[PDB]
Amino acid sequence: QSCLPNWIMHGKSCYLFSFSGNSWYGSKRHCSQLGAHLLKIDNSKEFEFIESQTSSHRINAFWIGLSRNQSEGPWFWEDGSAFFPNSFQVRNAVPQESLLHNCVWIHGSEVYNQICNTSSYSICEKEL
Amino acid sequence: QSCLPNWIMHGKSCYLFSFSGNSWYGSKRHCSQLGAHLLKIDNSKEFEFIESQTSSHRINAFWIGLSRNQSEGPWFWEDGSAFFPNSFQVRNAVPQESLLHNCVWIHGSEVYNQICNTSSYSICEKEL
Ligand SMILES: OC[C@H]1O[C@@H](O[C@@H]2[C@@H](O)[C@H](O[C@@H]3[C@@H](O)[C@H](O)O[C@H](CO)[C@H]3O)O[C@H](CO)[C@H]2O)[C@H](O)[C@@H](O)[C@@H]1O
Ligand SMILES: [Ca+2]
Ligand SMILES: [Ca+2]
Ligand SMILES: [Cl-]
Ligand SMILES: [Cl-]
Ligand SMILES: [Cl-]
Ligand SMILES: [Cl-]
């Protein structure tokens, strides 16, 4: 069971911390080109591991595999599974200030909705 | 290089034509559980192959891996790559009638946007 150079092993996956600017869509294409996808956070153990990385690189936010279609509809993971907030809840959530913010990134220790094509860093995940 | 039972080979890929009603999200999940994604159509040859399966099964529509994130914003594929209308264009297209329709499905020979939540068949794809 093995990961590429520069990918970290944790839990049951290999993660790539992409220190390189990009839209949510761009980030997505980029992970998918390495045969991965954007990060999916299943349990709190995974969350905590990721959170160590993001919070020790607070200069920047990292796109994750979470988004929605309806400019105010339900969040869903890259794999299409539904969002349940057992590790975190998505922030900036009041009606008005959520408008157009349909992609999710992590910045520091928080997970925010953000305008999908803001440029940022990202995290890919390949399962084992 | 090989496909699972019931998946059909064509061009570079294995396909599964899934006759089970499900939402776009649902369909997406199901593909992903078999270790695949929803259909991504990279050219006319792929389109035409798909198109004869969809037109010979006009009773239902088939979800595909194309969606957008904001009620009037750019279409993107499951993989993050942007939509170019090489083989077809998305239909019901005037700014007002396609609000809340941010997922795409194929019905007969036409590619429509729809309410992501609607129930339907779907097509999965795993590239060799
Ligand atoms: O979505 C969760 C699901 O992802 C599955 O992986 C696929 C990737 O295999 C795929 O990458 C494709 C390459 O394999 C192929 O060679 O090239 C095409 C086009 O460049 C790539 O799309 O990317 C999709 C979308 O990110 C992934 O879903 C995993 O196998 C599976 O374990 C996981 O559940
Ligand atoms: Ca995960
Ligand atoms: Ca394809
Ligand atoms: Cl993804
Ligand atoms: Cl998909
Ligand atoms: Cl057309
Ligand atoms: Cl048509």
PDB file of C-alpha atoms and ligand atoms in Angstrom:
ATOM      1  CA  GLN A   1       0.000   0.000   0.000  1.00  0.00           C
ATOM      2  CA  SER A   2       1.963   3.058  -1.177  1.00  0.00           C
ATOM      3  CA  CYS A   3       1.828   6.803  -2.010  1.00  0.00           C
ATOM      4  CA  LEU A   4       3.635   8.860  -4.541  1.00  0.00           C
ATOM      5  CA  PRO A   5       6.651  10.956  -3.791  1.00  0.00           C
ATOM      6  CA  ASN A   6       5.518  14.050  -1.953  1.00  0.00           C
ATOM      7  CA  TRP A   7       2.263  12.546  -0.879  1.00  0.00           C
ATOM      8  CA  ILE A   8       1.641  11.951   2.840  1.00  0.00           C
ATOM      9  CA  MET A   9       0.058   8.772   4.189  1.00  0.00           C
ATOM     10  CA  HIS A  10      -2.591   9.123   6.794  1.00  0.00           C
ATOM     11  CA  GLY A  11      -5.518   6.965   7.879  1.00  0.00           C
ATOM     12  CA  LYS A  12      -6.310   5.150   4.748  1.00  0.00           C
ATOM     13  CA  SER A  13      -5.174   7.607   2.119  1.00  0.00           C
ATOM     14  CA  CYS A  14      -2.445   9.546   0.509  1.00  0.00           C
ATOM     15  CA  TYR A  15      -2.761  13.330   0.597  1.00  0.00           C
ATOM     16  CA  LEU A  16      -1.109  15.963  -1.516  1.00  0.00           C
ATOM     17  CA  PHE A  17      -0.860  19.433  -0.111  1.00  0.00           C
ATOM     18  CA  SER A  18      -0.782  21.611  -3.146  1.00  0.00           C
ATOM     19  CA  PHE A  19       1.043  24.778  -2.368  1.00  0.00           C
ATOM     20  CA  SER A  20       0.009  26.285  -5.629  1.00  0.00           C
ATOM     21  CA  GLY A  21      -2.621  28.894  -6.492  1.00  0.00           C
ATOM     22  CA  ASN A  22      -5.745  27.882  -8.370  1.00  0.00           C
ATOM     23  CA  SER A  23      -9.509  28.107  -8.652  1.00  0.00           C
ATOM     24  CA  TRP A  24     -11.737  25.449  -7.032  1.00  0.00           C
ATOM     25  CA  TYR A  25     -12.212  24.093 -10.523  1.00  0.00           C
ATOM     26  CA  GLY A  26      -8.526  24.316 -11.385  1.00  0.00           C
ATOM     27  CA  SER A  27      -7.575  22.620  -8.100  1.00  0.00           C
ATOM     28  CA  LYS A  28     -10.073  19.984  -8.958  1.00  0.00           C
ATOM     29  CA  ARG A  29      -8.723  19.335 -12.506  1.00  0.00           C
ATOM     30  CA  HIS A  30      -5.188  19.234 -11.085  1.00  0.00           C
ATOM     31  CA  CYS A  31      -5.998  16.518  -8.491  1.00  0.00           C
ATOM     32  CA  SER A  32      -7.847  14.564 -11.074  1.00  0.00           C
ATOM     33  CA  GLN A  33      -4.908  14.689 -13.455  1.00  0.00           C
ATOM     34  CA  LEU A  34      -2.830  12.899 -10.759  1.00  0.00           C
ATOM     35  CA  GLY A  35      -5.696  10.360 -10.546  1.00  0.00           C
ATOM     36  CA  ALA A  36      -6.795  11.755  -7.180  1.00  0.00           C
ATOM     37  CA  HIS A  37      -9.601  14.037  -6.041  1.00  0.00           C
ATOM     38  CA  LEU A  38     -10.134  16.934  -3.684  1.00  0.00           C
ATOM     39  CA  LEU A  39      -9.988  16.100   0.007  1.00  0.00           C
ATOM     40  CA  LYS A  40     -12.990  14.385   1.543  1.00  0.00           C
ATOM     41  CA  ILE A  41     -13.135  14.542   5.302  1.00  0.00           C
ATOM     42  CA  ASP A  42     -14.936  11.482   6.708  1.00  0.00           C
ATOM     43  CA  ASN A  43     -14.184  11.289  10.449  1.00  0.00           C
ATOM     44  CA  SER A  44     -12.735  13.540  13.140  1.00  0.00           C
ATOM     45  CA  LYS A  45      -9.392  11.733  13.073  1.00  0.00           C
ATOM     46  CA  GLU A  46      -8.967  12.750   9.408  1.00  0.00           C
ATOM     47  CA  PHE A  47     -10.167  16.224  10.151  1.00  0.00           C
ATOM     48  CA  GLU A  48      -7.607  16.677  12.945  1.00  0.00           C
ATOM     49  CA  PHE A  49      -4.745  15.540  10.767  1.00  0.00           C
ATOM     50  CA  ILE A  50      -5.705  17.908   7.992  1.00  0.00           C
ATOM     51  CA  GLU A  51      -6.277  20.642  10.559  1.00  0.00           C
ATOM     52  CA  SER A  52      -2.658  20.339  11.718  1.00  0.00           C
ATOM     53  CA  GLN A  53      -1.509  20.994   8.292  1.00  0.00           C
ATOM     54  CA  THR A  54      -3.812  23.896   7.468  1.00  0.00           C
ATOM     55  CA  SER A  55      -3.393  25.656  10.737  1.00  0.00           C
ATOM     56  CA  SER A  56       0.394  25.482  10.514  1.00  0.00           C
ATOM     57  CA  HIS A  57       0.159  27.112   7.112  1.00  0.00           C
ATOM     58  CA  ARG A  58      -2.312  29.866   7.974  1.00  0.00           C
ATOM     59  CA  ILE A  59      -0.884  32.212   5.239  1.00  0.00           C
ATOM     60  CA  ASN A  60      -3.269  30.443   2.953  1.00  0.00           C
ATOM     61  CA  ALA A  61      -6.526  28.657   2.526  1.00  0.00           C
ATOM     62  CA  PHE A  62      -6.852  25.179   1.026  1.00  0.00           C
ATOM     63  CA  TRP A  63      -9.711  24.170  -1.290  1.00  0.00           C
ATOM     64  CA  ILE A  64     -11.400  20.947  -0.345  1.00  0.00           C
ATOM     65  CA  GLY A  65     -13.781  18.606  -2.150  1.00  0.00           C
ATOM     66  CA  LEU A  66     -16.929  20.185  -0.774  1.00  0.00           C
ATOM     67  CA  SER A  67     -19.395  22.293  -2.751  1.00  0.00           C
ATOM     68  CA  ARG A  68     -23.006  22.940  -3.656  1.00  0.00           C
ATOM     69  CA  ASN A  69     -25.002  23.750  -6.777  1.00  0.00           C
ATOM     70  CA  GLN A  70     -27.959  25.779  -5.535  1.00  0.00           C
ATOM     71  CA  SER A  71     -26.612  29.229  -4.651  1.00  0.00           C
ATOM     72  CA  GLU A  72     -28.375  28.277  -1.321  1.00  0.00           C
ATOM     73  CA  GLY A  73     -28.866  24.467  -1.362  1.00  0.00           C
ATOM     74  CA  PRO A  74     -27.395  21.375   0.350  1.00  0.00           C
ATOM     75  CA  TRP A  75     -23.564  20.764   0.548  1.00  0.00           C
ATOM     76  CA  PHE A  76     -22.190  17.588  -0.997  1.00  0.00           C
ATOM     77  CA  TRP A  77     -18.763  15.945  -1.182  1.00  0.00           C
ATOM     78  CA  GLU A  78     -16.775  15.373  -4.380  1.00  0.00           C
ATOM     79  CA  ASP A  79     -17.816  11.761  -4.229  1.00  0.00           C
ATOM     80  CA  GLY A  80     -21.518  12.839  -4.139  1.00  0.00           C
ATOM     81  CA  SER A  81     -22.132  11.794  -0.554  1.00  0.00           C
ATOM     82  CA  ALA A  82     -24.107  14.232   1.604  1.00  0.00           C
ATOM     83  CA  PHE A  83     -22.538  16.516   4.163  1.00  0.00           C
ATOM     84  CA  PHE A  84     -22.957  15.769   7.804  1.00  0.00           C
ATOM     85  CA  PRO A  85     -21.187  18.133  10.192  1.00  0.00           C
ATOM     86  CA  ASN A  86     -19.544  15.670  12.582  1.00  0.00           C
ATOM     87  CA  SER A  87     -16.180  17.287  12.509  1.00  0.00           C
ATOM     88  CA  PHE A  88     -17.008  20.846  11.572  1.00  0.00           C
ATOM     89  CA  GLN A  89     -19.699  23.167  10.237  1.00  0.00           C
ATOM     90  CA  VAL A  90     -19.203  25.463   7.223  1.00  0.00           C
ATOM     91  CA  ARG A  91     -18.809  29.139   8.175  1.00  0.00           C
ATOM     92  CA  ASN A  92     -20.347  32.464   6.916  1.00  0.00           C
ATOM     93  CA  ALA A  93     -23.770  30.821   6.915  1.00  0.00           C
ATOM     94  CA  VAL A  94     -26.419  33.592   7.322  1.00  0.00           C
ATOM     95  CA  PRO A  95     -28.736  33.858   4.204  1.00  0.00           C
ATOM     96  CA  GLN A  96     -27.347  37.094   2.535  1.00  0.00           C
ATOM     97  CA  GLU A  97     -23.550  36.653   2.943  1.00  0.00           C
ATOM     98  CA  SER A  98     -23.659  33.022   1.666  1.00  0.00           C
ATOM     99  CA  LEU A  99     -24.902  34.134  -1.804  1.00  0.00           C
ATOM    100  CA  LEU A 100     -22.420  32.921  -4.581  1.00  0.00           C
ATOM    101  CA  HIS A 101     -20.162  31.271  -2.030  1.00  0.00           C
ATOM    102  CA  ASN A 102     -20.632  27.711  -3.140  1.00  0.00           C
ATOM    103  CA  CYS A 103     -17.203  26.140  -2.771  1.00  0.00           C
ATOM    104  CA  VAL A 104     -15.539  25.233   0.492  1.00  0.00           C
ATOM    105  CA  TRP A 105     -12.022  25.870   1.648  1.00  0.00           C
ATOM    106  CA  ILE A 106     -10.111  25.475   4.904  1.00  0.00           C
ATOM    107  CA  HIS A 107      -8.250  28.500   6.258  1.00  0.00           C
ATOM    108  CA  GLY A 108      -6.417  28.091   9.573  1.00  0.00           C
ATOM    109  CA  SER A 109      -8.829  25.882  11.563  1.00  0.00           C
ATOM    110  CA  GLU A 110     -12.068  26.978   9.970  1.00  0.00           C
ATOM    111  CA  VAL A 111     -13.984  25.771   7.016  1.00  0.00           C
ATOM    112  CA  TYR A 112     -15.643  28.634   5.025  1.00  0.00           C
ATOM    113  CA  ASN A 113     -17.805  28.858   1.925  1.00  0.00           C
ATOM    114  CA  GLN A 114     -16.120  30.934  -0.693  1.00  0.00           C
ATOM    115  CA  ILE A 115     -16.605  32.070  -4.244  1.00  0.00           C
ATOM    116  CA  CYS A 116     -15.671  29.032  -6.326  1.00  0.00           C
ATOM    117  CA  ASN A 117     -13.066  30.635  -8.448  1.00  0.00           C
ATOM    118  CA  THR A 118     -11.010  32.461  -5.954  1.00  0.00           C
ATOM    119  CA  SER A 119      -7.425  31.430  -6.411  1.00  0.00           C
ATOM    120  CA  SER A 120      -5.931  29.372  -3.610  1.00  0.00           C
ATOM    121  CA  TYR A 121      -4.086  26.281  -2.486  1.00  0.00           C
ATOM    122  CA  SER A 122      -5.694  22.880  -2.306  1.00  0.00           C
ATOM    123  CA  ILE A 123      -5.482  19.370  -0.965  1.00  0.00           C
ATOM    124  CA  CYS A 124      -5.820  16.215  -3.068  1.00  0.00           C
ATOM    125  CA  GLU A 125      -6.666  12.805  -1.726  1.00  0.00           C
ATOM    126  CA  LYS A 126      -6.164   9.347  -3.148  1.00  0.00           C
ATOM    127  CA  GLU A 127      -7.711   6.464  -1.202  1.00  0.00           C
ATOM    128  CA  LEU A 128      -5.985   3.083  -0.704  1.00  0.00           C
TER     129      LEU A 128
ATOM    130  CA  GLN B   1      -6.690  -3.641 -20.085  1.00  0.00           C
ATOM    131  CA  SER B   2     -10.160  -4.748 -18.839  1.00  0.00           C
ATOM    132  CA  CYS B   3     -13.745  -3.952 -17.623  1.00  0.00           C
ATOM    133  CA  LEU B   4     -16.007  -5.283 -14.962  1.00  0.00           C
ATOM    134  CA  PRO B   5     -18.921  -7.510 -15.760  1.00  0.00           C
ATOM    135  CA  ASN B   6     -21.655  -5.404 -17.265  1.00  0.00           C
ATOM    136  CA  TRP B   7     -19.452  -2.540 -18.122  1.00  0.00           C
ATOM    137  CA  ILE B   8     -19.040  -1.924 -21.849  1.00  0.00           C
ATOM    138  CA  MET B   9     -15.656  -1.009 -23.321  1.00  0.00           C
ATOM    139  CA  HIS B  10     -15.361   1.822 -25.767  1.00  0.00           C
ATOM    140  CA  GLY B  11     -12.508   4.128 -26.849  1.00  0.00           C
ATOM    141  CA  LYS B  12     -10.411   4.492 -23.758  1.00  0.00           C
ATOM    142  CA  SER B  13     -13.033   3.581 -21.213  1.00  0.00           C
ATOM    143  CA  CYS B  14     -15.414   1.284 -19.449  1.00  0.00           C
ATOM    144  CA  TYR B  15     -19.020   2.426 -19.137  1.00  0.00           C
ATOM    145  CA  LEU B  16     -21.918   1.426 -16.980  1.00  0.00           C
ATOM    146  CA  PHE B  17     -25.392   2.281 -18.049  1.00  0.00           C
ATOM    147  CA  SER B  18     -27.253   2.365 -14.857  1.00  0.00           C
ATOM    148  CA  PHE B  19     -30.986   1.686 -14.995  1.00  0.00           C
ATOM    149  CA  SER B  20     -31.761   2.754 -11.421  1.00  0.00           C
ATOM    150  CA  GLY B  21     -33.539   5.914 -10.588  1.00  0.00           C
ATOM    151  CA  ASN B  22     -31.473   8.273  -8.497  1.00  0.00           C
ATOM    152  CA  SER B  23     -30.685  11.907  -8.032  1.00  0.00           C
ATOM    153  CA  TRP B  24     -27.675  13.488  -9.629  1.00  0.00           C
ATOM    154  CA  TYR B  25     -25.975  13.280  -6.233  1.00  0.00           C
ATOM    155  CA  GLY B  26     -27.130   9.734  -5.751  1.00  0.00           C
ATOM    156  CA  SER B  27     -25.977   8.679  -9.219  1.00  0.00           C
ATOM    157  CA  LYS B  28     -22.669  10.351  -8.545  1.00  0.00           C
ATOM    158  CA  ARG B  29     -22.252   8.425  -5.261  1.00  0.00           C
ATOM    159  CA  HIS B  30     -23.126   5.093  -6.879  1.00  0.00           C
ATOM    160  CA  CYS B  31     -20.497   5.495  -9.634  1.00  0.00           C
ATOM    161  CA  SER B  32     -17.970   6.511  -7.118  1.00  0.00           C
ATOM    162  CA  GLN B  33     -18.690   3.487  -5.013  1.00  0.00           C
ATOM    163  CA  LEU B  34     -17.755   1.247  -7.949  1.00  0.00           C
ATOM    164  CA  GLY B  35     -14.563   3.263  -8.152  1.00  0.00           C
ATOM    165  CA  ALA B  36     -15.674   5.365 -11.137  1.00  0.00           C
ATOM    166  CA  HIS B  37     -17.202   8.747 -11.917  1.00  0.00           C
ATOM    167  CA  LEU B  38     -20.155  10.073 -13.852  1.00  0.00           C
ATOM    168  CA  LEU B  39     -19.720  10.218 -17.619  1.00  0.00           C
ATOM    169  CA  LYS B  40     -17.365  12.793 -19.090  1.00  0.00           C
ATOM    170  CA  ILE B  41     -17.648  13.275 -22.795  1.00  0.00           C
ATOM    171  CA  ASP B  42     -14.313  14.271 -24.333  1.00  0.00           C
ATOM    172  CA  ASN B  43     -15.288  14.280 -28.054  1.00  0.00           C
ATOM    173  CA  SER B  44     -17.614  13.426 -30.898  1.00  0.00           C
ATOM    174  CA  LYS B  45     -16.690   9.776 -31.015  1.00  0.00           C
ATOM    175  CA  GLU B  46     -17.504   9.292 -27.340  1.00  0.00           C
ATOM    176  CA  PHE B  47     -20.604  11.331 -27.757  1.00  0.00           C
ATOM    177  CA  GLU B  48     -21.930   9.290 -30.636  1.00  0.00           C
ATOM    178  CA  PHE B  49     -21.370   6.001 -28.838  1.00  0.00           C
ATOM    179  CA  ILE B  50     -23.216   7.299 -25.784  1.00  0.00           C
ATOM    180  CA  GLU B  51     -25.851   8.884 -27.986  1.00  0.00           C
ATOM    181  CA  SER B  52     -26.904   5.540 -29.468  1.00  0.00           C
ATOM    182  CA  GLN B  53     -27.386   4.095 -26.028  1.00  0.00           C
ATOM    183  CA  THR B  54     -29.374   7.106 -24.890  1.00  0.00           C
ATOM    184  CA  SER B  55     -31.534   7.295 -28.038  1.00  0.00           C
ATOM    185  CA  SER B  56     -32.358   3.591 -27.890  1.00  0.00           C
ATOM    186  CA  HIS B  57     -33.625   4.064 -24.375  1.00  0.00           C
ATOM    187  CA  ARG B  58     -35.718   7.235 -24.764  1.00  0.00           C
ATOM    188  CA  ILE B  59     -38.067   6.211 -21.876  1.00  0.00           C
ATOM    189  CA  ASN B  60     -35.563   7.659 -19.420  1.00  0.00           C
ATOM    190  CA  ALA B  61     -32.895  10.293 -19.171  1.00  0.00           C
ATOM    191  CA  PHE B  62     -29.356   9.522 -17.964  1.00  0.00           C
ATOM    192  CA  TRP B  63     -27.492  11.744 -15.505  1.00  0.00           C
ATOM    193  CA  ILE B  64     -23.986  12.666 -16.626  1.00  0.00           C
ATOM    194  CA  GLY B  65     -20.968  14.245 -14.999  1.00  0.00           C
ATOM    195  CA  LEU B  66     -21.690  17.832 -15.934  1.00  0.00           C
ATOM    196  CA  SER B  67     -22.964  20.460 -13.502  1.00  0.00           C
ATOM    197  CA  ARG B  68     -22.562  24.061 -12.526  1.00  0.00           C
ATOM    198  CA  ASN B  69     -22.238  25.750  -9.138  1.00  0.00           C
ATOM    199  CA  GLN B  70     -24.278  28.817  -9.500  1.00  0.00           C
ATOM    200  CA  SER B  71     -27.715  29.251 -11.032  1.00  0.00           C
ATOM    201  CA  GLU B  72     -26.153  31.061 -14.052  1.00  0.00           C
ATOM    202  CA  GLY B  73     -22.463  30.135 -14.187  1.00  0.00           C
ATOM    203  CA  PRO B  74     -19.964  28.102 -16.247  1.00  0.00           C
ATOM    204  CA  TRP B  75     -20.573  24.321 -16.762  1.00  0.00           C
ATOM    205  CA  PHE B  76     -17.785  22.034 -15.555  1.00  0.00           C
ATOM    206  CA  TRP B  77     -17.133  18.306 -15.774  1.00  0.00           C
ATOM    207  CA  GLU B  78     -16.804  15.847 -12.846  1.00  0.00           C
ATOM    208  CA  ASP B  79     -13.088  16.192 -13.219  1.00  0.00           C
ATOM    209  CA  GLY B  80     -13.032  19.995 -13.029  1.00  0.00           C
ATOM    210  CA  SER B  81     -12.237  20.553 -16.695  1.00  0.00           C
ATOM    211  CA  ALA B  82     -14.335  23.301 -18.295  1.00  0.00           C
ATOM    212  CA  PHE B  83     -17.202  22.750 -20.722  1.00  0.00           C
ATOM    213  CA  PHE B  84     -16.586  23.309 -24.395  1.00  0.00           C
ATOM    214  CA  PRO B  85     -19.486  22.560 -26.755  1.00  0.00           C
ATOM    215  CA  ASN B  86     -17.530  20.209 -29.089  1.00  0.00           C
ATOM    216  CA  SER B  87     -20.143  17.662 -29.563  1.00  0.00           C
ATOM    217  CA  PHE B  88     -23.326  19.248 -28.225  1.00  0.00           C
ATOM    218  CA  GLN B  89     -24.758  22.243 -26.342  1.00  0.00           C
ATOM    219  CA  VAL B  90     -26.829  22.172 -23.073  1.00  0.00           C
ATOM    220  CA  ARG B  91     -30.580  22.965 -23.639  1.00  0.00           C
ATOM    221  CA  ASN B  92     -33.376  25.038 -22.026  1.00  0.00           C
ATOM    222  CA  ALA B  93     -30.765  27.762 -22.188  1.00  0.00           C
ATOM    223  CA  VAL B  94     -32.370  31.253 -21.823  1.00  0.00           C
ATOM    224  CA  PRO B  95     -31.262  32.982 -18.503  1.00  0.00           C
ATOM    225  CA  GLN B  96     -34.734  32.715 -16.739  1.00  0.00           C
ATOM    226  CA  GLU B  97     -36.096  29.214 -17.468  1.00  0.00           C
ATOM    227  CA  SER B  98     -32.821  27.421 -16.500  1.00  0.00           C
ATOM    228  CA  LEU B  99     -32.683  28.856 -12.910  1.00  0.00           C
ATOM    229  CA  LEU B 100     -32.264  26.003 -10.310  1.00  0.00           C
ATOM    230  CA  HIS B 101     -31.239  23.655 -13.132  1.00  0.00           C
ATOM    231  CA  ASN B 102     -27.577  23.036 -12.421  1.00  0.00           C
ATOM    232  CA  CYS B 103     -27.066  19.380 -13.285  1.00  0.00           C
ATOM    233  CA  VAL B 104     -27.039  17.862 -16.760  1.00  0.00           C
ATOM    234  CA  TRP B 105     -28.633  14.748 -18.134  1.00  0.00           C
ATOM    235  CA  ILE B 106     -29.052  13.178 -21.579  1.00  0.00           C
ATOM    236  CA  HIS B 107     -32.558  12.311 -22.745  1.00  0.00           C
ATOM    237  CA  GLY B 108     -32.932  10.724 -26.211  1.00  0.00           C
ATOM    238  CA  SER B 109     -30.391  12.686 -28.269  1.00  0.00           C
ATOM    239  CA  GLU B 110     -30.468  15.964 -26.415  1.00  0.00           C
ATOM    240  CA  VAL B 111     -28.532  17.247 -23.443  1.00  0.00           C
ATOM    241  CA  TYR B 112     -30.712  19.244 -20.972  1.00  0.00           C
ATOM    242  CA  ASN B 113     -29.993  20.967 -17.676  1.00  0.00           C
ATOM    243  CA  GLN B 114     -32.261  19.889 -14.816  1.00  0.00           C
ATOM    244  CA  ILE B 115     -33.080  20.128 -11.085  1.00  0.00           C
ATOM    245  CA  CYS B 116     -30.134  18.187  -9.547  1.00  0.00           C
ATOM    246  CA  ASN B 117     -32.508  16.443  -7.269  1.00  0.00           C
ATOM    247  CA  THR B 118     -34.668  14.778  -9.938  1.00  0.00           C
ATOM    248  CA  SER B 119     -34.716  11.014 -10.213  1.00  0.00           C
ATOM    249  CA  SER B 120     -33.210   9.295 -13.208  1.00  0.00           C
ATOM    250  CA  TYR B 121     -30.869   6.816 -14.696  1.00  0.00           C
ATOM    251  CA  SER B 122     -27.211   7.511 -15.074  1.00  0.00           C
ATOM    252  CA  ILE B 123     -24.014   6.586 -16.833  1.00  0.00           C
ATOM    253  CA  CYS B 124     -20.693   5.854 -15.044  1.00  0.00           C
ATOM    254  CA  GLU B 125     -17.238   5.924 -16.491  1.00  0.00           C
ATOM    255  CA  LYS B 126     -13.887   4.502 -15.471  1.00  0.00           C
ATOM    256  CA  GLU B 127     -11.007   5.191 -17.853  1.00  0.00           C
ATOM    257  CA  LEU B 128      -8.505   2.420 -18.684  1.00  0.00           C
TER     258      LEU B 128
HETATM  259  O1  LIG C   1     -14.724  10.295  -6.643  1.00  0.00           O
HETATM  260  C1  LIG C   1     -14.260   9.363  -5.658  1.00  0.00           C
HETATM  261  C2  LIG C   1     -13.619   8.172  -6.356  1.00  0.00           C
HETATM  262  O2  LIG C   1     -12.570   8.632  -7.201  1.00  0.00           O
HETATM  263  C3  LIG C   1     -12.041   7.584  -8.011  1.00  0.00           C
HETATM  264  O3  LIG C   1     -11.072   8.126  -8.906  1.00  0.00           O
HETATM  265  C4  LIG C   1     -11.328   8.842 -10.113  1.00  0.00           C
HETATM  266  C5  LIG C   1     -10.024   9.015 -10.887  1.00  0.00           C
HETATM  267  O4  LIG C   1      -9.578   7.741 -11.366  1.00  0.00           O
HETATM  268  C6  LIG C   1     -10.215   9.963 -12.064  1.00  0.00           C
HETATM  269  O5  LIG C   1      -8.970  10.159 -12.731  1.00  0.00           O
HETATM  270  C7  LIG C   1      -9.076   9.826 -14.113  1.00  0.00           C
HETATM  271  C8  LIG C   1      -7.862   9.004 -14.533  1.00  0.00           C
HETATM  272  O6  LIG C   1      -7.913   7.720 -13.902  1.00  0.00           O
HETATM  273  C9  LIG C   1      -7.824   8.827 -16.046  1.00  0.00           C
HETATM  274  O7  LIG C   1      -6.641   8.111 -16.416  1.00  0.00           O
HETATM  275  O8  LIG C   1      -7.822  10.110 -16.669  1.00  0.00           O
HETATM  276  C10 LIG C   1      -9.041  10.814 -16.432  1.00  0.00           C
HETATM  277  C11 LIG C   1      -9.050  12.104 -17.245  1.00  0.00           C
HETATM  278  O9  LIG C   1      -7.819  12.806 -17.043  1.00  0.00           O
HETATM  279  C12 LIG C   1      -9.189  11.103 -14.941  1.00  0.00           C
HETATM  280  O10 LIG C   1     -10.462  11.714 -14.698  1.00  0.00           O
HETATM  281  O11 LIG C   1     -10.705  11.215 -11.587  1.00  0.00           O
HETATM  282  C13 LIG C   1     -12.010  11.089 -11.024  1.00  0.00           C
HETATM  283  C14 LIG C   1     -12.554  12.471 -10.678  1.00  0.00           C
HETATM  284  O12 LIG C   1     -11.685  13.105  -9.732  1.00  0.00           O
HETATM  285  C15 LIG C   1     -11.956  10.195  -9.789  1.00  0.00           C
HETATM  286  O13 LIG C   1     -13.285   9.997  -9.291  1.00  0.00           O
HETATM  287  C16 LIG C   1     -11.385   6.535  -7.120  1.00  0.00           C
HETATM  288  O14 LIG C   1     -10.934   5.439  -7.924  1.00  0.00           O
HETATM  289  C17 LIG C   1     -12.359   6.024  -6.060  1.00  0.00           C
HETATM  290  O15 LIG C   1     -11.651   5.233  -5.100  1.00  0.00           O
HETATM  291  C18 LIG C   1     -13.051   7.179  -5.348  1.00  0.00           C
HETATM  292  O16 LIG C   1     -14.107   6.670  -4.526  1.00  0.00           O
HETATM  293 CA    CA C   2     -11.221  11.229   3.297  1.00  0.00          CA
HETATM  294 CA    CA C   3     -14.868  10.117 -21.450  1.00  0.00          CA
HETATM  295 CL    CL C   4     -12.781  16.384  -6.974  1.00  0.00          CL
HETATM  296 CL    CL C   5     -18.840  11.844 -10.465  1.00  0.00          CL
HETATM  297 CL    CL C   6     -26.643  20.190 -29.593  1.00  0.00          CL
HETATM  298 CL    CL C   7     -30.248  17.474 -30.041  1.00  0.00          CL
END
